[PDB]
RNA sequence: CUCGAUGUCGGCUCGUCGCAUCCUGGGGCUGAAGAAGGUCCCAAGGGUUGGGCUGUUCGCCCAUUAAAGCGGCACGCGAGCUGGGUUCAGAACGUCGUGAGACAGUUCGGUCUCUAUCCGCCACGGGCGCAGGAGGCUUGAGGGGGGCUCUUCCUAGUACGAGAGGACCGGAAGGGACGCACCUCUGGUUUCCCAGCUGUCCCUCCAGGGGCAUAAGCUGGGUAGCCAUGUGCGGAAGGGAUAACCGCUGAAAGCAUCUAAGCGGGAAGCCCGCCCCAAGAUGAGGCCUCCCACGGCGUCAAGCCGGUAAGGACCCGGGAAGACCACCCGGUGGAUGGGCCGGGGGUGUAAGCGCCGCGAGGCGUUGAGCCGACCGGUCCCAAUCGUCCGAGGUCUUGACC
C-alpha cells in the first residue's frame, strides 16, 4: 500500500542518484521494473513525462537530472535499462540474500 | 491410446438460436503410441522411436481405428467426435489448495451474535464420548485444486480445422485454459 | 427471490396494496418466488376494504422483480419494482385490471388472463 | 491456561528421533570465475569483482 | 433509442433494459447512467444524449 | 468404578449408526372396480422443508410437501461456541418462621481458561523397499464418491363407469432441494487502475503535483483471478445373483402341493456397470524406450574408486504448484521472468495553447490522458559459467536357439 510505494519511492530516488544500490533480492527485483518504467518516461521526455516521473520522485535536481542526464544514455534500447544483480552475502541476524541492481551500462 | 484428448481452449457462448455457451479445445493428432492388447502374454506399451525432436529431452473400436492412425506413422486427427455428440472430459482440478472446512466442504459457520466475534470459519465437531475416538468419515481441510476432475453427459456441438479444434456444450473443463483435457461419450444416457 | 417476508405491491386491483411472502410455491425445499412463480403470502395492507382487506391469507404470482431475469435469449430484463398478482387457486387473477407491464413469462407458465390485461408486457 | 500439555515423559529415544528428520547440507557453492577459489555459486566476492564486469573492489 | 436517454451505453450486441411502473420504462446501459437517473430528474441530465 | 474430581438442561455445528419404515420400491389382503384409502409381509437407498410463542425438548399454531419417521451413541458431543436455564453472594415479591433463614413458586442481573505429547483424523514432504542403472505408460484386487422427487402431457378422459371419476401398461417436458465442475452471459469483488472532493502541510506565486487525513482520508466506477445470486452437468440405462412376493414340472400322501431334488417370474434394494483413488496388495505387478561390463585390493572379496547426461540433481528463472516440501514448464543453440512493443479492458477527453463571460466556468484541440495481472511479437534486462551423484548386471532349476 502506502508503503509499497514509499519504497519504490526513496529507492527509485536514491538509485538514479547512484544507479545501482544494495537491497535484498525482491526489493531490487521490483525497484527495477518501476524505477525501470520511470526511466522509459525520462525517455518520453516532456512536460507530461516529467510531470509524472517527478509526480512520484518529487525533486527537480534529479527528476530533470535523469530525464536529461541519463535518459539519453538510453534513448535507443527497449526497457531493461536496469540489470538486477543478486549478491553473495546476507545481512546478519537476519540472513537475507540482499543483492545489488544498477542501470545496465 | 484408447480415447482422444488435448487441452483447454477457453469459454465464451454466442449465437445458436436461443443462444448457448461452450468452450474451445485444442488438439490435432497427438501421434499413436503402441496400443492395448494382452495377447500370447503381457502386452501393452512399446516404443519404436519416431516422436518429436525434443521428447528425448525426457527420453475394440476406440483403440482400433487407432491401428488406423497409429500405424499411419503416428499421429491421428481428432474430431470422429462430430456434429452434436457426447464425449466426456477429465480436466485437472485447479491449484486451489488447502482451505478451511468452509468452501472445501459445504457447511454453516459462526452464526449471528457470534457469526463475527472475531470468531468464524471452523467446523463444529468430531465424535461423541462413548462411540470411539474418531471416524475416517468427516472430511477435513482436504486440499483441492489438484484433483483429477471430470464429468459426464459431455455433449460436443461442432468443430473445424485451422488448427484441429472443437466447440463444446457447456465448458466446466475443470482445469484452466491451456490445461490438460481428455474426452470420450462414455456410457451415455442421452445416447 | 422474494420469500420469508419480502414485500411486493399490486398492479391489478384485486383490492390490495402490498403483500408479505410466506412460502415459495412448488414443493418442499424450494427457496424462491420469481415472476411466473406463485407465492404463499398475505396482505401487509389493502385499500379501504375494497374486497380483500389488510392481513388476508392469500395466493399470488410473479411478474415484477428487480432480481433481473435472464432471458433464454441470452438477454436480460428487470424492473424498478417487485410485486405481483393474487389468484383463485385456479391460477386465475382477481384484479379485473392490470398496472405495470410484465414479461412474456406468465404466458410460458400460464396466466394469459393478465398477459393481455397488462398495459404492456416486456 | 494449559488445556493441553504432554501426558507421559516424551521418550528421549523418540524425542531425539523427532529431532531426527532434521539435518544440514553444506552450501552448494562452486569455484571462482577467474577469481580462483570457492564462491557462492553465482556471485563475485572478496575474491572476485568480476563475473564479466568489475563490479566490486578488493 | 439512446439508452432510453443515457447516450453513453454498455454491454454487447445484447445490452439490457431496466424498467419502472405504469407501462413506463428505462432501456439501459452503464453504471454512470443508472444510479443517477434511477434516483432524479432526467432533464438536467447532461454528459449524454440529453444535455448533448 | 469417578469427591487428588467424568463440566450437568435446550441450542449450534459435524454426524453416525438401527428398524419395529414417515416419503420412497416390491409384494399378499380388503367389506379393493376406478381413484384414493385400510391390513400385513420385504426392503433402509436416498430423503424427511420456513416460521411462530416458548430457556426449552415437548408442544399447539401458521404456509408447504411425497414425506414432513421412532430411537441409539454418557437421552453423541464445553479441552468446539452457546451459555437462556435450572444451579454462587445480590435483591425483589409471595411464603413460612418470635425469629435467623428460608422454597422443583416466581422476578432483574451474575468472570466458560491462547501453546495437542501419544492414540486418532486430513493432508504434504522424507526414508528404505520392490536386488542391473535407467524416463515415459498402464492393470486394477481392494477401497471411496454418488443414488431422492414433485408436477405437467398422449396413450385416455378409452378400461371401471348409473354418475361426480379416475388406471395398471407404454411414452414426452418441466421443476425442486443436492453435488462436481466453470466465467462465456449475470451479479459481488477490484487497497491504487482510472476519475470527481472538501481540510491541510511542502512544493516556487499561479498553475501542475505531494503525504496525511487508517493501514487508501471520502465518494463513482472499474478488467484479470477468485466467487455466487449466475454457466454445464449430474443422479440413467442395461447385465447377473435375490426379499416378500407369484408360477411350471412332480414324489413321498395310487388323489393335491412352488417342493428337498429340476427349471423360471419378481424389487429405489446386493454384485457389476457410471466417477475417485490405488500394489508400502513387503504376492512390491505390465509394458516400451534408452544405458553396457571400469579400476585395484585374499574370495561365495553381492567390499572400497572413475565412469556411461541413459540419466538425474543441485543453483538460477519462472507457474490457479503451491505453508515448507514435494509437483509442472523453462535455463541465453533461450522467449522463463521482467522490459518494451501491438492488442484487447478499464477509466471519461489530460498536461498546454487556444478561442466566449468582469469571475465562476465553457467550448476546442481531444472519445483525450492514464492505464495492475488478459492475447501475442522483439534476445533491452536477468536465467553465465560450474558441481554432485549415479549401473552393472545374486543363488537354484529347466524350456527353447
PDB file of N, CA and C in Angstrom, chain C residues 22-74:
ATOM      1  N   UNK C  22     -44.859 -15.522   2.330  1.00  0.00           N
ATOM      2  CA  UNK C  22     -44.670 -16.696   3.166  1.00  0.00           C
ATOM      3  C   UNK C  22     -43.790 -17.717   2.444  1.00  0.00           C
ATOM      4  N   UNK C  23     -44.419 -18.634   1.711  1.00  0.00           N
ATOM      5  CA  UNK C  23     -43.697 -19.720   1.037  1.00  0.00           C
ATOM      6  C   UNK C  23     -43.575 -19.536  -0.474  1.00  0.00           C
ATOM      7  N   UNK C  24     -42.494 -20.078  -1.031  1.00  0.00           N
ATOM      8  CA  UNK C  24     -42.360 -20.240  -2.473  1.00  0.00           C
ATOM      9  C   UNK C  24     -43.107 -21.519  -2.867  1.00  0.00           C
ATOM     10  N   UNK C  25     -44.081 -21.376  -3.756  1.00  0.00           N
ATOM     11  CA  UNK C  25     -44.992 -22.460  -4.075  1.00  0.00           C
ATOM     12  C   UNK C  25     -44.409 -23.408  -5.107  1.00  0.00           C
ATOM     13  N   UNK C  26     -44.495 -24.700  -4.822  1.00  0.00           N
ATOM     14  CA  UNK C  26     -43.996 -25.708  -5.742  1.00  0.00           C
ATOM     15  C   UNK C  26     -43.832 -27.074  -5.102  1.00  0.00           C
ATOM     16  N   UNK C  27     -43.005 -27.146  -4.058  1.00  0.00           N
ATOM     17  CA  UNK C  27     -42.734 -28.412  -3.378  1.00  0.00           C
ATOM     18  C   UNK C  27     -41.466 -28.437  -2.537  1.00  0.00           C
ATOM     19  N   UNK C  28     -41.632 -28.683  -1.243  1.00  0.00           N
ATOM     20  CA  UNK C  28     -40.502 -28.787  -0.325  1.00  0.00           C
ATOM     21  C   UNK C  28     -39.334 -27.908  -0.751  1.00  0.00           C
ATOM     22  N   UNK C  29     -38.208 -28.062  -0.065  1.00  0.00           N
ATOM     23  CA  UNK C  29     -37.052 -27.227  -0.331  1.00  0.00           C
ATOM     24  C   UNK C  29     -37.483 -25.922  -0.970  1.00  0.00           C
ATOM     25  N   UNK C  30     -37.146 -25.757  -2.243  1.00  0.00           N
ATOM     26  CA  UNK C  30     -37.503 -24.549  -2.970  1.00  0.00           C
ATOM     27  C   UNK C  30     -37.382 -23.314  -2.083  1.00  0.00           C
ATOM     28  N   UNK C  31     -36.753 -22.276  -2.621  1.00  0.00           N
ATOM     29  CA  UNK C  31     -36.480 -21.076  -1.854  1.00  0.00           C
ATOM     30  C   UNK C  31     -36.742 -19.808  -2.651  1.00  0.00           C
ATOM     31  N   UNK C  32     -37.624 -19.830  -3.646  1.00  0.00           N
ATOM     32  CA  UNK C  32     -37.685 -18.639  -4.491  1.00  0.00           C
ATOM     33  C   UNK C  32     -38.944 -18.364  -5.297  1.00  0.00           C
ATOM     34  N   UNK C  33     -39.354 -17.100  -5.261  1.00  0.00           N
ATOM     35  CA  UNK C  33     -40.520 -16.617  -5.980  1.00  0.00           C
ATOM     36  C   UNK C  33     -40.109 -15.655  -7.090  1.00  0.00           C
ATOM     37  N   UNK C  34     -39.937 -16.190  -8.294  1.00  0.00           N
ATOM     38  CA  UNK C  34     -39.563 -15.390  -9.455  1.00  0.00           C
ATOM     39  C   UNK C  34     -40.684 -15.292 -10.476  1.00  0.00           C
ATOM     40  N   UNK C  35     -41.188 -14.081 -10.677  1.00  0.00           N
ATOM     41  CA  UNK C  35     -42.252 -13.874 -11.642  1.00  0.00           C
ATOM     42  C   UNK C  35     -42.540 -15.201 -12.334  1.00  0.00           C
ATOM     43  N   UNK C  36     -43.809 -15.437 -12.646  1.00  0.00           N
ATOM     44  CA  UNK C  36     -44.231 -16.728 -13.159  1.00  0.00           C
ATOM     45  C   UNK C  36     -44.433 -17.675 -11.996  1.00  0.00           C
ATOM     46  N   UNK C  37     -43.499 -17.646 -11.054  1.00  0.00           N
ATOM     47  CA  UNK C  37     -43.641 -18.429  -9.838  1.00  0.00           C
ATOM     48  C   UNK C  37     -44.889 -17.966  -9.090  1.00  0.00           C
ATOM     49  N   UNK C  38     -45.322 -18.755  -8.114  1.00  0.00           N
ATOM     50  CA  UNK C  38     -46.534 -18.455  -7.358  1.00  0.00           C
ATOM     51  C   UNK C  38     -46.265 -18.457  -5.856  1.00  0.00           C
ATOM     52  N   UNK C  39     -46.664 -17.387  -5.170  1.00  0.00           N
ATOM     53  CA  UNK C  39     -46.288 -17.194  -3.766  1.00  0.00           C
ATOM     54  C   UNK C  39     -47.416 -17.391  -2.748  1.00  0.00           C
ATOM     55  N   UNK C  40     -47.034 -17.813  -1.544  1.00  0.00           N
ATOM     56  CA  UNK C  40     -47.975 -18.084  -0.456  1.00  0.00           C
ATOM     57  C   UNK C  40     -47.867 -17.051   0.662  1.00  0.00           C
ATOM     58  N   UNK C  41     -48.208 -15.801   0.359  1.00  0.00           N
ATOM     59  CA  UNK C  41     -48.115 -14.723   1.345  1.00  0.00           C
ATOM     60  C   UNK C  41     -49.466 -14.059   1.611  1.00  0.00           C
ATOM     61  N   UNK C  42     -49.433 -12.886   2.243  1.00  0.00           N
ATOM     62  CA  UNK C  42     -50.659 -12.205   2.664  1.00  0.00           C
ATOM     63  C   UNK C  42     -50.611 -10.679   2.559  1.00  0.00           C
ATOM     64  N   UNK C  43     -51.665 -10.030   3.049  1.00  0.00           N
ATOM     65  CA  UNK C  43     -51.767  -8.582   2.990  1.00  0.00           C
ATOM     66  C   UNK C  43     -50.892  -7.931   4.045  1.00  0.00           C
ATOM     67  N   UNK C  44     -50.053  -7.003   3.605  1.00  0.00           N
ATOM     68  CA  UNK C  44     -49.351  -6.121   4.522  1.00  0.00           C
ATOM     69  C   UNK C  44     -50.242  -4.903   4.716  1.00  0.00           C
ATOM     70  N   UNK C  45     -51.194  -4.758   3.803  1.00  0.00           N
ATOM     71  CA  UNK C  45     -52.159  -3.673   3.843  1.00  0.00           C
ATOM     72  C   UNK C  45     -52.877  -3.595   2.502  1.00  0.00           C
ATOM     73  N   UNK C  46     -54.183  -3.348   2.553  1.00  0.00           N
ATOM     74  CA  UNK C  46     -55.006  -3.278   1.350  1.00  0.00           C
ATOM     75  C   UNK C  46     -56.058  -2.171   1.442  1.00  0.00           C
ATOM     76  N   UNK C  47     -56.190  -1.406   0.362  1.00  0.00           N
ATOM     77  CA  UNK C  47     -57.131  -0.294   0.310  1.00  0.00           C
ATOM     78  C   UNK C  47     -58.072  -0.274   1.515  1.00  0.00           C
ATOM     79  N   UNK C  48     -59.065   0.627   1.479  1.00  0.00           N
ATOM     80  CA  UNK C  48     -60.135   0.702   2.469  1.00  0.00           C
ATOM     81  C   UNK C  48     -61.187  -0.387   2.252  1.00  0.00           C
ATOM     82  N   UNK C  49     -60.771  -1.642   2.405  1.00  0.00           N
ATOM     83  CA  UNK C  49     -61.687  -2.772   2.323  1.00  0.00           C
ATOM     84  C   UNK C  49     -62.381  -2.921   0.986  1.00  0.00           C
ATOM     85  N   UNK C  50     -61.634  -2.732  -0.095  1.00  0.00           N
ATOM     86  CA  UNK C  50     -62.180  -2.997  -1.411  1.00  0.00           C
ATOM     87  C   UNK C  50     -62.935  -4.309  -1.340  1.00  0.00           C
ATOM     88  N   UNK C  51     -62.200  -5.408  -1.483  1.00  0.00           N
ATOM     89  CA  UNK C  51     -62.782  -6.746  -1.423  1.00  0.00           C
ATOM     90  C   UNK C  51     -61.843  -7.692  -0.683  1.00  0.00           C
ATOM     91  N   UNK C  52     -60.575  -7.306  -0.612  1.00  0.00           N
ATOM     92  CA  UNK C  52     -59.571  -8.123   0.038  1.00  0.00           C
ATOM     93  C   UNK C  52     -59.504  -7.790   1.522  1.00  0.00           C
ATOM     94  N   UNK C  53     -58.797  -6.714   1.846  1.00  0.00           N
ATOM     95  CA  UNK C  53     -58.656  -6.264   3.227  1.00  0.00           C
ATOM     96  C   UNK C  53     -57.302  -6.622   3.822  1.00  0.00           C
ATOM     97  N   UNK C  54     -56.719  -5.662   4.529  1.00  0.00           N
ATOM     98  CA  UNK C  54     -55.452  -5.868   5.204  1.00  0.00           C
ATOM     99  C   UNK C  54     -55.387  -7.299   5.736  1.00  0.00           C
ATOM    100  N   UNK C  55     -54.171  -7.810   5.911  1.00  0.00           N
ATOM    101  CA  UNK C  55     -53.948  -9.109   6.546  1.00  0.00           C
ATOM    102  C   UNK C  55     -54.902 -10.210   6.122  1.00  0.00           C
ATOM    103  N   UNK C  56     -54.880 -10.530   4.836  1.00  0.00           N
ATOM    104  CA  UNK C  56     -55.733 -11.585   4.320  1.00  0.00           C
ATOM    105  C   UNK C  56     -54.920 -12.726   3.730  1.00  0.00           C
ATOM    106  N   UNK C  57     -55.140 -13.932   4.244  1.00  0.00           N
ATOM    107  CA  UNK C  57     -54.491 -15.119   3.704  1.00  0.00           C
ATOM    108  C   UNK C  57     -54.644 -15.151   2.193  1.00  0.00           C
ATOM    109  N   UNK C  58     -53.566 -15.463   1.482  1.00  0.00           N
ATOM    110  CA  UNK C  58     -53.564 -15.216   0.050  1.00  0.00           C
ATOM    111  C   UNK C  58     -52.742 -16.156  -0.823  1.00  0.00           C
ATOM    112  N   UNK C  59     -52.857 -15.918  -2.129  1.00  0.00           N
ATOM    113  CA  UNK C  59     -52.121 -16.635  -3.157  1.00  0.00           C
ATOM    114  C   UNK C  59     -51.843 -15.690  -4.331  1.00  0.00           C
ATOM    115  N   UNK C  60     -50.565 -15.418  -4.605  1.00  0.00           N
ATOM    116  CA  UNK C  60     -50.184 -14.522  -5.709  1.00  0.00           C
ATOM    117  C   UNK C  60     -49.000 -15.043  -6.531  1.00  0.00           C
ATOM    118  N   UNK C  61     -48.767 -14.430  -7.690  1.00  0.00           N
ATOM    119  CA  UNK C  61     -47.726 -14.909  -8.596  1.00  0.00           C
ATOM    120  C   UNK C  61     -46.669 -13.864  -8.922  1.00  0.00           C
ATOM    121  N   UNK C  62     -45.710 -14.255  -9.760  1.00  0.00           N
ATOM    122  CA  UNK C  62     -44.532 -13.441 -10.059  1.00  0.00           C
ATOM    123  C   UNK C  62     -44.653 -12.676 -11.382  1.00  0.00           C
ATOM    124  N   UNK C  63     -44.315 -11.387 -11.365  1.00  0.00           N
ATOM    125  CA  UNK C  63     -44.374 -10.569 -12.578  1.00  0.00           C
ATOM    126  C   UNK C  63     -43.471  -9.344 -12.561  1.00  0.00           C
ATOM    127  N   UNK C  64     -42.999  -8.962 -11.377  1.00  0.00           N
ATOM    128  CA  UNK C  64     -42.101  -7.812 -11.239  1.00  0.00           C
ATOM    129  C   UNK C  64     -41.043  -8.041 -10.157  1.00  0.00           C
ATOM    130  N   UNK C  65     -39.794  -8.214 -10.587  1.00  0.00           N
ATOM    131  CA  UNK C  65     -38.681  -8.440  -9.673  1.00  0.00           C
ATOM    132  C   UNK C  65     -37.402  -7.807 -10.194  1.00  0.00           C
ATOM    133  N   UNK C  66     -36.837  -6.908  -9.397  1.00  0.00           N
ATOM    134  CA  UNK C  66     -35.587  -6.247  -9.740  1.00  0.00           C
ATOM    135  C   UNK C  66     -34.413  -7.205  -9.575  1.00  0.00           C
ATOM    136  N   UNK C  67     -34.719  -8.492  -9.433  1.00  0.00           N
ATOM    137  CA  UNK C  67     -33.691  -9.516  -9.287  1.00  0.00           C
ATOM    138  C   UNK C  67     -33.020  -9.791 -10.627  1.00  0.00           C
ATOM    139  N   UNK C  68     -33.650  -9.318 -11.701  1.00  0.00           N
ATOM    140  CA  UNK C  68     -33.118  -9.481 -13.051  1.00  0.00           C
ATOM    141  C   UNK C  68     -33.296 -10.883 -13.596  1.00  0.00           C
ATOM    142  N   UNK C  69     -34.073 -11.006 -14.670  1.00  0.00           N
ATOM    143  CA  UNK C  69     -34.365 -12.311 -15.263  1.00  0.00           C
ATOM    144  C   UNK C  69     -33.635 -12.530 -16.593  1.00  0.00           C
ATOM    145  N   UNK C  70     -32.798 -13.565 -16.642  1.00  0.00           N
ATOM    146  CA  UNK C  70     -32.009 -13.871 -17.835  1.00  0.00           C
ATOM    147  C   UNK C  70     -32.862 -14.561 -18.878  1.00  0.00           C
ATOM    148  N   UNK C  71     -33.138 -13.869 -19.975  1.00  0.00           N
ATOM    149  CA  UNK C  71     -33.990 -14.445 -20.999  1.00  0.00           C
ATOM    150  C   UNK C  71     -33.215 -15.410 -21.885  1.00  0.00           C
ATOM    151  N   UNK C  72     -33.712 -16.646 -21.987  1.00  0.00           N
ATOM    152  CA  UNK C  72     -33.113 -17.677 -22.809  1.00  0.00           C
ATOM    153  C   UNK C  72     -32.457 -17.018 -24.005  1.00  0.00           C
ATOM    154  N   UNK C  73     -32.898 -15.802 -24.288  1.00  0.00           N
ATOM    155  CA  UNK C  73     -32.332 -15.037 -25.365  1.00  0.00           C
ATOM    156  C   UNK C  73     -31.098 -14.334 -24.827  1.00  0.00           C
ATOM    157  N   UNK C  74     -30.257 -15.078 -24.116  1.00  0.00           N
ATOM    158  CA  UNK C  74     -29.050 -14.508 -23.522  1.00  0.00           C
ATOM    159  C   UNK C  74     -29.247 -13.042 -23.191  1.00  0.00           C
TER     160      UNK C  74
END
